[PDB]
Design a protein around this ligand. Structure first.
Ligand SMILES: Cc1cn([C@H]2C[C@H](O)[C@@H](COP(=O)(O)OP(=O)(O)O)O2)c(=O)[nH]c1=O
Ligand SMILES: Cc1cn([C@H]2C[C@H](O)[C@@H](COP(=O)(O)OP(=O)(O)O)O2)c(=O)[nH]c1=O
Ligand SMILES: Cc1cn([C@H]2C[C@H](O)[C@@H](COP(=O)(O)OP(=O)(O)O)O2)c(=O)[nH]c1=O
Ligand SMILES: Cc1cn([C@H]2C[C@H](O)[C@@H](COP(=O)(O)OP(=O)(O)O)O2)c(=O)[nH]c1=O
Ligand SMILES: Cc1cn([C@H]2C[C@H](O)[C@@H](COP(=O)(O)OP(=O)(O)O)O2)c(=O)[nH]c1=O
Ligand SMILES: Cc1cn([C@H]2C[C@H](O)[C@@H](COP(=O)(O)OP(=O)(O)O)O2)c(=O)[nH]c1=O
Ligand SMILES: [Mg+2]
Ligand SMILES: [Mg+2]
Ligand SMILES: [Mg+2]
Ligand SMILES: [Mg+2]
Ligand SMILES: [Mg+2]
Ligand SMILES: [Mg+2]
Lengths: 132, 133, 132, 133, 132, 132
């Protein structure tokens, strides 16, 4: 049955004009935009919240700084097994066929974020879309 | 210099046929930047009727509004050199291959996309869709 | 309202692996396959009939020979204004954006045929699809 | 040498979503040749039930046949080095990006495409769809 | 008849990762690569030569600076009607379907140069590949 | 860290018009072209060198003949983790998502060579671009 998951199109996707490329990959796998906001600049604490479970990490600040270094889009996708399948679609820069595997080559600038659990999903959605 | 802003509507037939990223991608490939964007799961029939005010006396006016509310739409303010005209050309018409409608659309009504056609209608449409100015 | 038109994917489309490329262009413009046959080799008189209005032309024989020099696909597409709009989609090798304009560069090997009138349409369909 | 032939079905969800050329194109890009092709506007429920005989005792068997008759299908015999296995991998599954199903499908039932999985089921399926042998 | 033409993939193509995209359009139109040269920065002399006609124009200096502001690729293409077809393929920033039509939006940063005439083709080929 | 790697676009890429397609995949993964050479026919010496490890293998002669049976392009790519990422991008004819995975189907005619190691990368770059 349906799930929703949260996707962030990161600022590097704007710098490299891969926004539509990334969104189309999730679009062609038959997922739907239930919700979506463009942020010319995401307010920092939104980003910090979104990555709060990373607050103790070596990279936490640099990543938030990067995540704030350009536009981003937050999308709520709905579809069967959305969370897992979009996560897979995201992939990683070592796995060709996925978004990062095909278009990304950095440990921070990797184009996209996607929720990895029902709970991070539910959580991340409330962050970028509080009004529900 | 020539930096304009124009209003694009991704129409509901775009979503129905999963052509949304395809349409935006053509605009993205031509080097235009999203300045603002709003996803509407269903647009208020009010905003549609405003957007299309100049057509209020046309035979197609209500069928079209019906359609513009049949599904999601995305309103996008695009910015870049000579944006209005260039994006208007990118929209094209169902008769000219090479354009969005030319390649992708085949109806007088369900034509995937709207683009402002003048500095005047742009400023105004940007107004209708993003009241925050 | 609907029209049907007849499309031939020519043998050069098989040699150059542009079959799906061509069919997708007509597919993305929202036309439907109502009918379709693959011919590993089209019988010559089918080809000759199809081009019968060209029988007096300088190129008539060479073209039939070429049209017989590989597989072809005959498709009946249905859609609003099918005949005219697919014709346009076909285009010519001087008009970028069209099939020939983007992928073809010869006066004979031009990838695709599409009916240019309601009558040639009706006719060409009966040829490649007699069983109706 | 390794020249095999395999049977591909473009399923009806492919037509519904206008992904037919996309699917065939992936097979075309990998250098496989169409040996035969049949457009069915609606497949005889008989041929579907034969094609899926090995599944006759499965919970999904009838839902699936219902679906395989819900729209057009195209049956294609593809030929090329190591075709069965290679095209089977090209089909993949809805879990593996990079493949047809991986990139394009998201259902246990509506998965765009069928490919033979063995020399045995190939010869047989080629038989079911092209009796002319 | 069969001609050869000179294409320059300009540095914005590299900036925007459009090199393959550009070459791909010419490739798919069935034009062959006859020779080619990667230039991480083109000798300013060469650009000045290449754009000699333009030495009196306002945009001349600006253009040279840009033509040298990043890598370029110089390609010699061969094929039927190559000069004018590849010119058409190049197009302009107003009309979609073309390289510039689809991908460019500047009067100066326009991705690709293609010779526009029999003479200029000879001239330009000699500049970039003086070995013929 | 940042490496350089040697890619060869093999003659079947040219036969099948896949050059841009291949380069495009590497381009979109964000790898830069550091230098490049078009070869209408590669000197057989060069191929023999390039495939030196393989001098004892059954397929060695067959391969040399093919590697010389049409044009090739030799490219030096630079980028983070370039050798192994571009190797992954090259892939194999079994697993889709890769260049070979999506576009190739022969044990010998497989479109692209990419260096597989730090050493072979140095070696191969020296063969094709001995000027460094
Ligand atoms: C591990 C890591 C992550 N990041 C950034 C990019 C990651 O997408 C994000 C969270 O890291 P992580 O959860 O490891 O990646 P993923 O998004 O695949 O779950 O933080 C860095 O900037 N540097 C790093 O070293
Ligand atoms: C002319 C026409 C327009 N429409 C709708 C679709 C158009 O996008 C919208 C405005 O019409 P118009 O200004 O003619 O189209 P464009 O979007 O090219 O400016 O009205 C119809 O539904 N039926 C019609 O006959
Ligand atoms: C004019 C011409 C056509 N042909 C072939 C290719 C054409 O598609 C077909 C019919 O010619 P024509 O009707 O002129 O082209 P179209 O298909 O655009 O109507 O015959 C040649 O082989 N040589 C020629 O000189
Ligand atoms: C397992 C399964 C299959 N099917 C349908 C879709 C499959 O293409 C077909 C055969 O099943 P299966 O052999 O599992 O799939 P594949 O096509 O990968 O061999 O049956 C369902 O409708 N529901 C199901 O739960
Ligand atoms: C007209 C013009 C050209 N240019 C640059 C871009 C052009 O590709 C180049 C030569 O001009 P031109 O020959 O007009 O361009 P093309 O014939 O390639 O369309 O100089 C400018 O930078 N500014 C200008 O105003
Ligand atoms: C194994 C093998 C390789 N080759 C060719 C294709 C290979 O790209 C090349 C070198 O073999 P190999 O190093 O196995 O290929 P790669 O490491 O690039 O996958 O020789 C054959 O022609 N026949 C064969 O049986
Ligand atoms: Mg994580
Ligand atoms: Mg208007
Ligand atoms: Mg004609
Ligand atoms: Mg099975
Ligand atoms: Mg000029
Ligand atoms: Mg090796």
């Amino acid at each position: 049955g349906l799930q929703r998951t949260l996707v962030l199109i990161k600022p590097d996707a704007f710098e490299r004009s891969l926004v539509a490329e990334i969104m189309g990959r999730i679009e062609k796998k038959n997922f739907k935009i239930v919700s979506m906001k463009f942020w010319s600049k995401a307010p920092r604490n939104l980003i910090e919240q979104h990555y709060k479970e990373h607050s103790e990490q070596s990279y936490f600040n640099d990543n938030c700084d990067f995540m704030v270094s350009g536009p981003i889009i937050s999308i709520v996708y709905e579809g069967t097994d959305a969370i897992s399948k979009i996560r897979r679609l995201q992939g990683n820069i070592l796995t060709p066929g996925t978004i990062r595997g095909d278009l990304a080559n950095d440990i921070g600038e990797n184009l996209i974020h996607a929720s990895d659990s029902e709970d991070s999903a539910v959580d991340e959605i409330s962050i970028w879309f509080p009004e529900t």
